[PDB]
Amino acid sequence: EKFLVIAGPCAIESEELLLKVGEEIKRLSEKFKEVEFVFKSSFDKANRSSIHSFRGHGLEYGVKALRKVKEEFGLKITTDIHESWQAEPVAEVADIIQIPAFLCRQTDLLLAAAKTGRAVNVKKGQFLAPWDTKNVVEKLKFGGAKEIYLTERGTTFGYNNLVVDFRSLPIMKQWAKVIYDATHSVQLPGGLGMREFIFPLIRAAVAVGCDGVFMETHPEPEKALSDASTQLPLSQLEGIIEAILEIREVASKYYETI
Amino acid sequence: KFLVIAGPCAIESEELLLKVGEEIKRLSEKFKEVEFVFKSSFDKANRSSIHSFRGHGLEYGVKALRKVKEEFGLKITTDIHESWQAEPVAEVADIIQIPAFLCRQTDLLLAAAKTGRAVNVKKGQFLAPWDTKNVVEKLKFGGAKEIYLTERGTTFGYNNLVVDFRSLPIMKQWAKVIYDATHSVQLPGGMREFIFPLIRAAVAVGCDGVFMETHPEPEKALSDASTQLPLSQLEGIIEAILEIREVASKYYETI
Amino acid sequence: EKFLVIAGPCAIESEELLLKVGEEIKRLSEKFKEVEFVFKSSFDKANRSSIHSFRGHGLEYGVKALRKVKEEFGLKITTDIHESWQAEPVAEVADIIQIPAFLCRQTDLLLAAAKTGRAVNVKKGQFLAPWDTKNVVEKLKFGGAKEIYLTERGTTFGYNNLVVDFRSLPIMKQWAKVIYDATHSVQLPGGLGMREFIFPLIRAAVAVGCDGVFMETHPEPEKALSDASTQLPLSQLEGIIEAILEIREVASKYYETI
Amino acid sequence: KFLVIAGPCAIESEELLLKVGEEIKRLSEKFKEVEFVFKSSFDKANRSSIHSFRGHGLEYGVKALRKVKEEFGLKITTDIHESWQAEPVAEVADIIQIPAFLCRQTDLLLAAAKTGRAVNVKKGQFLAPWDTKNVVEKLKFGGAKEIYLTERGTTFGYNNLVVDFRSLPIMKQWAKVIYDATHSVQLPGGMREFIFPLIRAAVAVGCDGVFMETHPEPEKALSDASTQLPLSQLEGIIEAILEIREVASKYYETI
Ligand SMILES: CCC(OP(=O)(O)O)C(=O)O
Ligand SMILES: CCC(OP(=O)(O)O)C(=O)O
Ligand SMILES: CCC(OP(=O)(O)O)C(=O)O
Ligand SMILES: CCC(OP(=O)(O)O)C(=O)O
């Protein structure tokens, strides 16, 4: 099946930033024709740890910016919602509506996304066990969602640390397509992440077997207004994608049937 | 004064709230040194299953809670799940409760703070004790002056929560601390036998209040049936923690 | 029942150190007649993280020193063993043979301690679940142990951190007397512990209900050759004991029947 | 060359070792680029129950292992549990294995190092990856020159282990790293369905070898019956990880 690569800057710092990253993602989409690229960027970081951290420029501005990326590059779009009322307006541009990890159990939010007719990707909560995502999928199907994804992004392991239990991939695959979040899984919650572990863990993900990967990427991560310690330098995206496609190919014959 | 937040998990009916409200009113008159706050949720917005009980809506809930306050003169507290709910809930709620999964949702915290009411945030199962400092800062920036942080367990492997009592003294540095005796022993996706033992630990360590879900017939409760405390056992547990607190308070560490 | 207080310097730095601490423990034993005091000190720290850390002066020297404490103060003695051959020689002086947390599953060590006729106290491994101590007790009873204790000393919680799940107290009480280790439960494994949490957690232990407490104490912890960050200053011992006896008394009527 | 440590969990009989040894010898001839090491324990010294199978003793075990080496020319490895066992086990064991629960026992490590043999330490379920540096230092101080560290899972709540693959690159800084594919999925006090998936992850991340318990009829094994790999499936898994390693190795990070 066509492998999914969800990538883009963590936050919509500006429409300019989006177009710059979008241009590169479009270039890669022309090279890796076996991959379905989906451009991602949040119009609002509604759960920052600090009240002083960057959040965004609003839903209106964000949707407009994402619409520009789609119009200029013909790329599919995904962004996350935080409250039920945002589902409808976001659905006007987003091909995939993303549900934040902390909100994976909020029934009304899931239902709001599901009734839009768009695909829905739920980030698995850091508090959730793999088998408990079955009910998350059930809620979505109940709400009308026909294309559902579950994203592995790490599990609470002691304080300010996340561990990736790769057994979650084959478990969740039982009821939905599975995406591996390569950048959030190495973040150290409330720590201030370890970028040195992004590549090795993404290699593990495709060796185990998943339906796609999620990666935050920015031209200059150190200057990012969010996830500055974990966003992947844009220039490194192509090489990482080539590597995972190669590993996926050689491991694919061994992927177990669900 | 020591706070005791109690009531049925969900507003299954105003009748249920009245029955429980009558008992909490009685204890309220018996333990004058304790500040009682009646609690019940108008909506269980985060149930695991789509087929589980959620409630009768916000309007019916605020109505029933209004009835408890008017008929018994008890303070009220209930939780909100989206920003728009803050204002209407504040009409009756003396303390607005923020769900554990939603303790990092900035707009929900700000919305609650804006009402002028007290705010009690359930510490997320994913949050470290020291990371609650930023939660308090959001509420203060939002205008809140009476702020509570509630210990309700931390993710410990799958489908299990552990109470790290070191959290009580840590969180006390920036807010009043409440110990949730019923959700702390629940097994996500619990054991009532551990409720009393751990609540005794909480007061021995030192906290500003305790939170307990109580129901006349927990077995029939439409929510948290395995952990809600039988109404008839509430008085005994309250007297027990007051006695333990009386002796232990001598040793509570300064701030 | 008579509450147990197991206390003493972590390691047998010298026979002098033992006598100094022993004198204070003897004084307290005369005051707190409702408490059964047991003097503790390790003749060898056989599991230090670093090869460069202090271990001890040998079994022979240690046993001799402990024998001096018992002879001079009439105090019961306890120390830990690391290999089966040490059980017999240690049993000559130790009233209670202690089994290290990492070795709580080593069948031969438990059996070696059990056949001596002495009481045996097993530190619950940081990897062990409360209900899995039932088999530990079974092994001991099988080996002839008639007086058995299980000691709560924390559980692995992420990296370099331990958490005390107080539910373990009533669970383990089902099959053995339970001791709460107040100083090791706050240590941060391979961290370099937080002494500020020793007192609050010990208060929790007696409120929940246990059969005794274990505390490492040293005249000048900062100068200790082991557990310098967690050993309780000797001058603070009396006050801590008074406090837990007071809390135990008021909470005792509520202790659940196993 | 890549290391593959395999064999039945316990020496249930020299006959069993011979049957498994014959297959490992065959694969040894098929995969010349791989260094095979035959493994089996002469004693399961840490069983949960006093009534569980331990083995036939050290003498019978070393005897059977000697038979495997002599009859097949395969390297040998078995674990020790007390210091005195190091010398006699070293008579046949090319690699002395240190149990996970015993990875911090200084005298056991030194005893193993003194024999002059290679030493493979199972990382304790309680140990952080970076804390294995001190384990290596003990062995070096003891005279060991060939040192391995084996990833076998970390305590994750109760009766569960999680494999934090970040450990592979971290431990590689100071020793050769082996991934234990069978114990990493066992549930303390497991699921065979996760063995292959995680071993694929291990080679994709990068390691120096893999450890696998294999038995002709795992269902009848007297130890780790729920996780031992059926002998007939070993060849396929080895070929699979060699292919994945061949492609993935291009991306292994430098030291
Ligand atoms: C909050 C934002 C976010 O992800 P989580 O919900 O998994 O943390 C994101 O991908 O932008
Ligand atoms: C969801 C409801 C709830 O608490 P948590 O947010 O701590 O789970 C409650 O107290 O009703
Ligand atoms: C190793 C020494 C030791 O305890 P643990 O086994 O619980 O760590 C002790 O109390 O001396
Ligand atoms: C006990 C035996 C054992 O391994 P651990 O020490 O990792 O559990 C083994 O590989 O035989």
SS3 A255: coil
Could you count the other beta carbons within 10 Å of the beta carbon of residue D29?
8
Of C96, C122, C119, the C-alpha closest to C109 is C122
Residues of chain C whose C-beta is under 8 A from some C-beta in D?
46-51, 55, 82-84, 102-103, 105-108, 125-132, 135, 138-139, 142, 155-156, 159-160, 189-190
Torsion on CA atoms D185, D188, D191, D192, rounded to nearest 10: 60
Distance from CA of A9 to the nearest CA of D (A): 24
CA dihedral over B9, B12, B14, B16, signed as positive or negative: negative
How many helices (H) and strands (E) are present in chain D, helices listed first? 8, 11
- Residue type at D37 in one-letter notation: V
- Residue type at B186 in one-letter notation: Q
| DSSP designation for A42 | B
What residues does D75 pair with on adjacent strands? D37
Could you count the other beta carbons within 10 Å of the beta carbon of residue A92?
11
Could you count the other beta carbons within 10 Å of the beta carbon of residue D217?
11
Q: Do C250 and B246 touch (CB under 8 A)?
A: yes
Residue at token pair 């937080």: C194
Of C172, C175, C137, C138, the C-alpha closest to C153 is C172
Residue B79 CA, ligand 2 centroid: distance in Å: 8
Q: Do D126 and C156 touch (CB under 8 A)?
A: yes
What gap in Å lies between CA B55 and CA B44, rounded to an integer? 7
Of B162, D76, D123, the C-alpha closest to C190 is D123
Distance from CA of D164 to the nearest CA of C (A): 11
| DSSP designation for A12 | -
Question: Are D68 and D38 a contacting pair, CB within 8 Å?
Answer: yes
Of B223, B184, B216, the C-alpha closest to B42 is B223
What values do phi and psi take at D117, rounded to 5? -80, 170
Give residues (CB < 6 A) around ligand 4: D 9, 41, 46, 79, 99-100, 122, 152, 183
What gap in Å lies between CA A212 and CA A210, rounded to an integer? 6
Q: Which helix (H) or strand (E) holds C178?
A: strand C177-181
Q: Do A159 and C159 touch (CB under 8 A)?
A: no
Token pair belonging to C31: 């005051």
Could you give the angle at the alpha carbon of B115 between the alpha carbons of B109 and B116, nearest 5°? 100
Question: Residue D233 contacts by C-beta under 8 Å, 6 or more apart in sequence?
Answer: none
Question: Residue C223 contacts by C-beta under 8 Å, 6 or more apart in sequence?
Answer: none
- Residue type at A244 in one-letter notation: I
What residues does C35 pair with on adjacent strands? C3
What are A241-245's contacts with CB under 8 Å, separation 24+? A241/A5, A241/A28, A241/A32, A241/A35, A242/A32, A243/A199, A243/A203, A243/D250, A243/D251, A244/A202, A244/A203, A244/A205, A244/A206, A244/A213, A245/A3, A245/A32, A245/A34, A245/A35
Question: Are B44 and B26 a contacting pair, CB within 8 Å?
Answer: no
Torsion on CA atoms D136, D141, D146, D147, rounded to nearest 10: -20
Distances C134 to B192, C129, C149 between C-alpha atoms, Å: 22, 10, 12
- Tally of CA atoms within 13 A in the half-sphere of A46 that contains its CB: 26
Q: Do D126 and C128 touch (CB under 8 A)?
A: no
Q: Nearest residue on chain B to C239, judged by CA atoms? A: B251
Question: Are C198 and C230 a contacting pair, CB within 8 Å?
Answer: yes
Of C119, C128, C139, the C-alpha closest to C79 is C119
Between β-strands C155-156 and C162-163, what pairing exists: parallel, antiparallel or unpaired? antiparallel
Could you count the other beta carbons within 10 Å of the beta carbon of residue B26?
13
SS3 A181: strand
Of D68, D57, D71, D131, the C-alpha closest to D94 is D68
Among the partner residues D191, D194, D248, nearest to A203 by beta-carbon distance: D248
Between β-strands B95-98 and C96-99, what pairing exists: parallel, antiparallel or unpaired? unpaired
What gap in Å lies between CA D204 and CA A246, rounded to an integer? 11
The beta strand positions in chain D, using DSSP E, are: 3-7, 35-39, 75-79, 95-98, 118-122, 147-151, 154-155, 161-162, 176-180, 209-215, 229-230
- Structural domain harbouring C148: 1-258
Question: Are D7 and D40 a contacting pair, CB within 8 Å?
Answer: yes
What residues does B151 pair with on adjacent strands? B179
Query: A26 exposed, middle or buried (CB, 10 Å; 0-12, 13-18, 19+)?
Result: middle
What gap in Å lies between CA D151 and CA D212, rounded to an integer? 12
What gap in Å lies between CA C105 and CA D101, rounded to an integer? 8
Residue B9 CA, ligand 2 centroid: distance in Å: 8
Question: Are D117 and D90 a contacting pair, CB within 8 Å?
Answer: yes
Query: D155 exposed, middle or buried (CB, 10 Å; 0-12, 13-18, 19+)?
Result: buried
Question: Are B103 and B127 a contacting pair, CB within 8 Å?
Answer: yes
Of C145, C96, C85, C142, the C-alpha closest to C123 is C96
- Please indicate whether residue C124, judged by its CB atom, sits closer than 6 Å to ligand 3: no
The beta strand positions in chain B, using DSSP E, are: 3-7, 35-39, 75-79, 95-98, 118-122, 147-151, 154-155, 161-162, 176-180, 209-215, 229-230
Distances B7 to B31, B39, B179, B215 between C-alpha atoms, Å: 16, 5, 15, 7
- Residue type at A234 in one-letter notation: L
Set of chain B residues whose Cβ sits within 8 Å of the Cβ of C206: 204
Q: How was this structure determined?
A: X-ray
Domain count for chain A:
1
What gap in Å lies between CA D163 and CA D179, rounded to an integer? 10
Q: Nearest residue on chain A to D155, judged by CA atoms? A: A157
Between β-strands C35-40 and C76-80, what pairing exists: parallel, antiparallel or unpaired? parallel
What gap in Å lies between CA C35 and CA C48, rounded to an integer? 32
SS3 B225: coil
- Tally of CA atoms within 13 A in the half-sphere of C244 that contains its CB: 30
What gap in Å lies between CA A94 and CA A81, rounded to an integer? 10
CATH of the domain at B61: 3.20.20.70
What gap in Å lies between CA B233 and CA C115, rounded to an integer? 46
What residues does C213 pair with on adjacent strands? C5, C180
Distances B149 to A52, B45, B137, B180 between C-alpha atoms, Å: 20, 20, 12, 10
Between β-strands A35-40 and A76-80, what pairing exists: parallel, antiparallel or unpaired? parallel
What values do phi and psi take at D126, rounded to 5? -100, -5
Question: Are A97 and A81 a contacting pair, CB within 8 Å?
Answer: yes
- Tally of CA atoms within 13 A in the half-sphere of B19 that contains its CB: 14
What gap in Å lies between CA A220 and CA A201, rounded to an integer? 22
Question: Are B160 and C161 a contacting pair, CB within 8 Å?
Answer: no
Among the partner residues C164, C170, C200, nearest to B197 by beta-carbon distance: C170
- Residue type at B8 in one-letter notation: P
- Residue type at A117 in one-letter notation: G
Question: Are D109 and D98 a contacting pair, CB within 8 Å?
Answer: yes
What residues does B10 pair with on adjacent strands? B41
Token pair belonging to D97: 């294995």
Residue A118 CA, ligand 4 centroid: distance in Å: 49
SS3 B162: strand
What gap in Å lies between CA D100 and CA D105, rounded to an integer? 10
What residues does C79 pair with on adjacent strands? C97
Q: Do D154 and C156 touch (CB under 8 A)?
A: yes
Distances B196 to B75, B192, B240 between C-alpha atoms, Å: 24, 8, 9
Could you give the angle at the alpha carbon of A222 between the alpha carbons of A220 and A227, nearest 5°? 100
What gap in Å lies between CA B204 and CA C164, rounded to an integer? 15
- Please indicate whether residue C184, judged by its CB atom, sits closer than 6 Å to ligand 3: yes
What gap in Å lies between CA C77 and CA C38, rounded to an integer? 5
Q: Is D120 left (phi over 0), alpha (psi -120 to 50) or beta?
A: beta
Q: Whose CA is nearest to atom 1 of ligand 1?
A: A100
Token pair belonging to C86: 């040490």
What gap in Å lies between CA C158 and CA C167, rounded to an integer? 19
Question: Residue B4 contacts by C-beta under 8 Å, 6 or more apart in sequence?
Answer: B27, B31, B34, B35, B36, B37, B209, B210, B212, B238
Resolution for the entry shown, Å: 1.8
How far out from the chain centre does Cα B202 lie? 14
- Residue type at D125 in one-letter notation: Q
Could you count the other beta carbons within 10 Å of the beta carbon of residue A33?
8
Of D11, D24, D2, the C-alpha closest to D148 is D2
Among the partner residues A46, A105, A108, nearest to B106 by beta-carbon distance: A46
Could you give the angle at the alpha carbon of B135 between the alpha carbons of B131 and B138, nearest 5°? 140
Among the partner residues D164, D201, D243, nearest to A250 by beta-carbon distance: D243
What gap in Å lies between CA D147 and CA C253, rounded to an integer? 56
Distance from CA of B186 to the nearest CA of A (A): 13
Of C215, C214, C128, the C-alpha closest to C172 is C128
What gap in Å lies between CA C192 and CA C202, rounded to an integer? 24
Of A70, A43, A47, A46, the C-alpha closest to A59 is A43
Question: Are D214 and D229 a contacting pair, CB within 8 Å?
Answer: yes
Query: C31 exposed, middle or buried (CB, 10 Å; 0-12, 13-18, 19+)?
Result: exposed
Q: Do B164 and C169 touch (CB under 8 A)?
A: no
What values do phi and psi take at C85, rounded to 5? -60, -20
Question: Are B60 and B27 a contacting pair, CB within 8 Å?
Answer: no
Query: C178 exposed, middle or buried (CB, 10 Å; 0-12, 13-18, 19+)?
Result: buried
- Tally of CA atoms within 13 A in the half-sphere of A106 that contains its CB: 24
SS3 C71: helix
Between β-strands D3-7 and D35-39, what pairing exists: parallel, antiparallel or unpaired? parallel
Set of chain D residues whose Cβ sits within 8 Å of the Cβ of B157: 156-158, 160
What residues does C50 pair with on adjacent strands? none
- Please indicate whether residue C107, judged by its CB atom, sits closer than 6 Å to ligand 3: no
Angle between helical axes of D234-248 and D14-30 (0-180°, round to 10): 40
Q: Whose CA is nearest to atom 7 of ligand 2?
A: B100
What gap in Å lies between CA A134 and CA D191, rounded to an integer? 19
Question: Are D162 and A165 a contacting pair, CB within 8 Å?
Answer: yes
